């Protein structure tokens, strides 16, 4: 019955990695059926860009008219913390209305990434997970990624941050992998993208020659 | 008079580096004293940009001026291979001349980077030198950059890229070490931007006592 | 000034350990086709040289007329510093255009060879690079060369001289050979030749066993 705007924030995946070009949406909903058509306005820092992108109306089961603007920005843009304003205009809302966003502001805070070794109770199953934890980060955006062998790996988990007492924000990062594959010695490696890290990457490393010491002396039990 | 007009292509670090965004520059040089005006215009795949920046005229001792105009690339729409083309427009010259400039055609391919540890003899120094080599990067542009527990050190040199015998290319790069942070066993990385990089970055580590590790006993006592 | 002067140094390795006489060229290009003849004239310390030599003209594919000129000089001649100058005159030419080539007034500098050896990873793949590094050499003139038994591999490969802080220059060279013949212990070694280095010439050899002597594989058993 009343409109409302919910105005998507840029990924951080795509807004911190160069491979991706991060994209703002601006959705509206609650459309009134006898105005299908909804003017946009767009606004960087009070200037209007013409590299606006529109989609075609969408109709849902509910019946409930949705239009979704997705807009290109560049990567350092975001970063920069530009004010980006989606303002609405239709015949039937009395007056336009506009919604503004901006990244989060705040003491930034370098974040600490450990490696955890598996669990001697795991080798009795088939699949061992893995665990990097990254913890210290104020801001909320973060990417985590797993990589071996220098591939990517397909089949892990990164768990929402969680806020700690001081402020700051911490979170696990599992991969599962076969047991063979931790017997042969294969590196795996947890890669951490956030704005506060230098040169916004960190890369760690862990396989079976961690937990043996640097001293080969295990031998075979008796 | 022999003018001259120079396209310096964007510096590879600053395309794959994320904290400045690639700078494109058409200077021209030459220009006679009684025709101050140069006009300049610049074409994104054939349309007008806003974003042409305009600077004074410099005066020089060898009675040539020298005027810089610099747009900014996105870093994703570089690797596209996305025509750039600058026009310049002078009085003096007989005809405006225009150069286009666009990405290389090739097959890229995944660089292999290795750490050398420092020999045992220069141990007797008063350094040591840390080796970065990096090989079978087949396009020219590379970035090579080293850091120590999260602070960038500023005392690498990186010899200019060679052809190799399969038309590959191998870089060095050298890094001087005080002996008494290298005894304590710092923590070392080497950090790699390619275009044909996974994230085009990796990161190698290099520390103290980190190859031939120590084998003493192979037999248990039972 | 029509015509130009292009100036070809003598070799720095060919200076180096006798294979042949090194040769300068004072080539002249961009030679006007209306007048092909030119006047070549020495300057060595004010006396002419006796070898002067000469070598017929050739047209390339462009309008660009190059004339080509060839010597024979003593390799301890090179060493002492002497002034060299060709001088090239022309009708095209208003005045003649002075090109003086003489060796590099600067203090030598010993340099310091080490070589590394190649990273476990590298004994994944079925090649093995050997890397050796020569630094602190003033003059940018030297030679690296990697020594074998009987000829040597042309698989090796210099990268050019680089400035460093203190105003010396270092360099690597790096040769792949197959990685069955680095557990043979095979003897391996680069030749590093520089003007100020004694007797012109040094050798460094590396080894796998070389790389660290300490005692290994201690097996106690109790019964």
Same mark, same amino acid.
């Not at 990417?143 to 790996?153: F, L, Y």
């Not at 969680?162 to 992998?177: A, I, N, Q, R």
């Not at 961690?210 to 008796?222: A, C, D, R």
């Given at each position: 019955?009343?409109?409302?705007?919910?105005?998507?924030?840029?990924?951080?995946?795509?807004?911190?990695?160069?491979?991706?070009?991060?994209?703002?949406?601006?959705?509206?909903?609650?459309?009134?059926?006898?105005?299908?058509?909804?003017?946009?306005?767009?606004?960087?820092?009070?200037?209007?860009?013409?590299?606006?992108?529109?989609?075609?109306?969408?109709?849902?089961?509910?019946?409930?008219?949705?239009?979704?603007?997705?807009?290109?920005?560049?990567?350092?843009?975001?970063?920069?913390?530009?004010?980006?304003?989606?303002?609405?205009?239709?015949?039937?809302?009395?007056?336009?209305?506009?919604?503004?966003?901006?990244?989060?502001? @705040?003491?930034?805070?370098?974040?600490?990434?450990?490696?955890?070794?598996?669990?001697?109770?795991?080798?009795?199953?088939?699949?061992?997970?893995?665990?990097?934890?990254?913890?210290?980060?104020?801001?909320?955006?973060?990417?985590?990624?797993?990589?071996?062998? @220098?591939?990517?790996?397909?089949?892990?988990?990164?768990?929402?941050?969680?806020?700690?007492?001081? @402020?700051?924000?911490?979170?696990?990062?599992?991969?599962?992998?076969?047991?063979?594959?931790?017997?042969? @010695?294969?590196?795996?490696?947890?890669?951490?993208?956030?704005?506060?890290?230098?040169?916004?990457?960190?890369?760690?490393?862990?396989?079976?020659?961690?937990?043996?010491?640097?001293?080969?002396?295990?031998?075979?039990?008796?």
């Amino acid at each position: 019955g009343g409109p409302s705007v919910f105005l998507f924030p840029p990924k951080p995946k795509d807004t911190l990695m160069i491979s991706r070009t991060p994209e703002v949406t601006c959705v509206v909903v609650d459309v009134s059926h006898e105005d299908p058509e909804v003017k946009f306005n767009w606004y960087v820092d009070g200037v209007e860009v013409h590299n606006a992108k529109t989609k075609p109306r969408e109709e849902q089961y509910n019946s409930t008219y949705r239009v979704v603007s997705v807009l290109t920005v560049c990567h350092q843009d975001w970063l920069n913390g530009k004010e980006y304003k989606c303002k609405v205009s239709n015949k039937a809302l009395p007056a336009p209305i506009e919604k503004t966003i901006s990244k989060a502001k @705040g003491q930034p805070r370098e974040p600490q990434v450990y490696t955890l070794p598996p669990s001697r109770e795991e080798m009795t199953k088939n699949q061992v997970s893995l665990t990097c934890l990254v913890k210290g980060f104020y801001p909320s955006d973060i990417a985590v990624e797993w990589e071996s062998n @220098g591939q990517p790996e397909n089949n892990y988990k990164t768990t929402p941050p969680v806020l700690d007492s001081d @402020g700051s924000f911490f979170l696990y990062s599992k991969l599962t992998v076969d047991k063979s594959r931790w017997q042969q @010695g294969n590196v795996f490696s947890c890669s951490v993208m956030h704005e506060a890290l230098h040169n916004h990457y960190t890369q760690k490393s862990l396989d079976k020659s961690t937990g043996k010491p640097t001293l080969y002396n295990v031998s075979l039990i008796m």
